């Protein structure tokens, strides 16, 4: 779900950046309410995420080549030998059905090599499950003697916004998703709107990203009146302030001049102490999934020589307790923890 | 001293506008804890019907299966609940889905080419190019295919665009619509938005008559501040129409001559429906859920 | 890609108002603001939903591996 | 009266890819030192 920025420099159109949207316009409230948002952490609305807000997909392509001069491995299935329920993932040709759900261990293709006289399969292996988007057979680098050995398979991996994923405004204010807060528990505006994204007010005094503050009242003014605003640098002056410009626009529309909104608590239901700073800010979802190195081991495999847990997250490997951790355990005088 | 009969004496309801989709009603002399409770229930706890299990047979369109399935779930169906029983999750799929627990919606669209003189319109250039919510055909099955005879399953908004196609592409699916609550997923929330706003209070401390009264009148929306004459003071005609923009406070001539507050007891609710149930039905069910929640705890053993 | 079903913030159906919006801009020759008002979008959250929609699906569809040329 | 976004213009160009000179010349001007450099390898004066 790509969206055109309300607040934008006119050069965005000059480079036709609308052909490739990089973000989405979100209702962002500068509020400290949940308690899970603080400095490097921001809150995303559950009901927004449920409605497809900031949803993304990731495509991965694999080349299955049979080269390792006489052809031995052939795409398909060998006669007389057939291990149970493989036909569920692959078609008669040995290639997978485009659209099929695959998990690690499932067969991604099938072949038969005469050297071993057995029907073998190339397994799909990744922590993330996928769906087959494209299967292309390529039989090149031959004049008359044609036979397929090379096949390109594209995987579609769906990526919903998860707790840990990074999100940022166009002002260098990045934060990890601390939680997907429910709309009933979310603070609700006088208008009846609950913010899509919650940014903590304690982020701004150190970063000094006032561009985001003026972007908030500009985006709100442009959403109401239905007009894009120019946010090209040095357009405004000390005498002609944007806070006054969009402030006048906000007052004309029927909202507070200083970009504030009277908001009510989602828990108590009572009106909050003061009016909360709410607006429309163009947010970007960063491609990285930070919890990729998530692991747990009780008693897994060990190396033959040291008889110590072997290295490897996916292999049920062990966490290293290095010299520094050894030093720290000596430090506490905690001899049994070291033991 | 507060009695439940003493609450009946002061508690008032005022209906400003009651449309087929949205109802604007007021709850006078009630606590924030009760008004917020109904609000929370109307969004999260009032059960509704939405597509949950989309079974794809073919999808040659540009729109990915996951995305297309998610869109169908988001489409509100003009289906009244209570007609459906709650599905049980522990028993398997063959026992799970029945004529009482599930509603089936099929989508079968194939795009082709049409001869027309050529910018040219997609409805002219191709046949079945745009897939709409109205293209979800209702298929009644089992023991009861006569209960939905005078009540056909049709999406609340039919002109909702579901997919866009080019000749050669096709969509073939069987969607299983079930009963669910808004707390689980936003697709099950029966309300478009159920929110309340406290009654704005404008405490005029000084008479502020004359030309300053005309200046004070422009600080609030047109139908809020009314002036009798040049004198006879400046009164508040309809404090309910106020947007609470605090525009009057950012003027030196009024910053100390007026106070902006609220009526903590008075709530202005605005409930819009997705299309399945009427906004009144959604509010009534919200009060019925809060009562049932307190009733279930009443007839319950207090263990340990 | 295509117009989203329901507004991300509140949940008001927006998917049926995309083709109707372009008709109010083309045939009716109205401004962006007035066109959204006639569609029944008063909240700025519902307003930006359609106003800010790109509709890359029309660009995406021009690549069809099922039809020649 | 404003510095608006092209909505009607955008959607028309999405359906109709121009048959004349491409839109956004600045985008082609961005890759001008790359294409131009390789172009001078065969075309231009002195062969």
């Amino acid at each position: 779900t790509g969206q055109t920025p309300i607040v934008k420099a006119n050069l965005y159109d000059d480079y036709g950046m609308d052909n490739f949207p990089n973000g989405f316009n979100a209702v962002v409230a500068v509020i400290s309410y949940t308690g899970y948002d603080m400095d490097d952490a921001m809150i995303i609305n559950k009901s927004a995420d449920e409605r497809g807000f900031g949803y993304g997909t990731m495509y991965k392509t694999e080349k299955v080549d049979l080269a390792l001069d006489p052809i031995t491995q052939h795409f398909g299935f060998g006669n007389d030998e057939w291990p149970k329920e493989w036909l569920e993932k692959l078609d008669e040709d040995g290639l997978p059905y485009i659209g099929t759900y695959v998990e690690e261990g499932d067969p991604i293709c099938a072949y038969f090599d005469d050297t071993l006289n057995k029907t073998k399969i190339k397994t799909y292996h990744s922590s993330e499950p996928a769906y087959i988007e494209e299967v292309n057979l390529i039989g090149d680098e031959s004049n008359k003697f044609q036979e397929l050995q090379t096949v390109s398979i594209k995987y579609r991996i769906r990526r919903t916004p998860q707790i840990g994923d990074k999100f940022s405004s166009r002002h260098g204010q990045k934060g990890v998703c601390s939680r997907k807060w429910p709309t009933i528990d979310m603070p609700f505006s006088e208008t009846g709107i609950q913010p899509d994204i919650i940014i903590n007010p304690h982020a701004f005094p150190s970063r000094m990203t006032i561009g985001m503050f003026v972007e908030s009242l500009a985006g709100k003014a442009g959403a109401l009146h239905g007009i894009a605003q120019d946010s090209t640098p040095w357009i405004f002056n000390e005498d002609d302030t944007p806070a006054d410009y969009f402030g006048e626009q906000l007052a004309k529309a029927g909202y507070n001049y200083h970009g504030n909104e009277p908001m009510y608590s989602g828990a108590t239901g009572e009106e909050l102490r003061a009016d909360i700073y709410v607006g429309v800010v163009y947010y970007q979802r960063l491609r990285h999934m930070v919890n990729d190195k998530f692991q747990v081991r009780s008693t897994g495999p060990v190396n033959s020589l040291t008889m110590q847990p072997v290295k490897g997250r996916k292999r049920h490997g062990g966490i290293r307790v290095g010299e520094m951790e050894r030093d720290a355990l000596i430090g506490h005088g905690t001899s049994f923890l070291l033991q | 001293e507060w009695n439940v009969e003493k609450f009946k004496k002061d508690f008032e309801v005022n209906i400003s506008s009651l449309d087929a989709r949205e109802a604007n009603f007021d709850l006078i002399n009630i606590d924030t804890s009760i008004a917020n409770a109904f609000r929370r229930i109307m969004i999260s706890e009032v059960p509704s019907v939405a597509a949950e299990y989309v079974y794809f047979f073919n999808n040659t369109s540009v729109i990915q299966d996951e995305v297309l399935a998610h869109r169908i779930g988001l489409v509100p169906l003009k289906v009244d609940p209570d007609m459906l029983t709650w599905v049980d999750s522990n028993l398997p799929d063959d026992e799970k889905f029945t004529d009482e627990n599930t509603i089936v919606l099929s989508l079968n669209v194939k795009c082709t080419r049409n001869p027309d003189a050529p910018s040219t319109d997609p409805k002219e250039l191709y046949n079945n190019a745009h897939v709409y919510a109205r293209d979800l055909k209702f298929e009644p099955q089992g023991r009861q295919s006569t209960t939905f005879a005078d009540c056909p399953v049709v999406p609340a908004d039919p002109d909702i665009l579901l997919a866009k196609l080019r000749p050669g592409q096709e969509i073939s699916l069987k969607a299983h619509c079930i009963l669910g609550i808004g707390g689980d997923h936003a697709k099950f929330s029966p309300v478009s938005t159920a929110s309340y706003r406290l009654l704005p209070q404008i405490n005029i401390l000084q008479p502020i008559k004359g030309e300053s009264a005309r200046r004070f009148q422009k600080c609030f929306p047109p139908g809020v501040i009314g002036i009798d004459e040049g004198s006879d003071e400046a009164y508040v005609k309809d404090a309910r129409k106020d947007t609470v923009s605090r525009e009057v406070l950012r003027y030196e001539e009024f910053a100390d001559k007026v106070k902006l507050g609220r009526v903590r007891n008075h709530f202005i609710f605005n409930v819009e429906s997705a299309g399945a149930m009427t906004p009144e039905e959604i509010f009534f069910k919200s009060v019925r859920i809060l009562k049932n929640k307190a009733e279930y705890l009443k007839n319950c053993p207090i263990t340990q | 890609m295509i117009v989203p079903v329901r507004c991300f913030s509140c949940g008001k159906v927006v998917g049926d108002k995309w083709e109707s919006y372009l008709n109010l801009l083309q045939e009716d020759e109205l401004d962006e603001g007035t066109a959204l008002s006639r569609l029944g979008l008063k909240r700025y959250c519902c307003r930006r939903m359609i106003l800010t929609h790109v509709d890359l699906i029309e660009k995406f569809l021009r690549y069809n591996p099922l039809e020649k040329r | 009266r404003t510095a608006d976004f092209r909505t009607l213009e955008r959607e028309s160009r999405f359906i109709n890819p121009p048959k004349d000179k491409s839109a956004f010349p600045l985008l082609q001007e961005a890759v001008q030192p790359h294409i131009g450099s390789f172009n001078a390898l065969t075309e231009g004066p002195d062969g």
């Binding site: - | 604007n24 047109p222 947007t243 202005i268 609710f269 605005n270 | - | 009266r1």
Partner: peptide, 24 residues
């Protein structure tokens, strides 16, 4: 230096919950 041009004919486009654009 020329000031940033203000937008032509800006009207009220936000009112109370159960109040429309009936007031002119």
């Amino acid at each position: 230096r020329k000031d940033v041009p203000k937008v032509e004919g800006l009207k009220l486009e936000h009112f109370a919950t159960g109040y429309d654009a009936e007031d002119f």
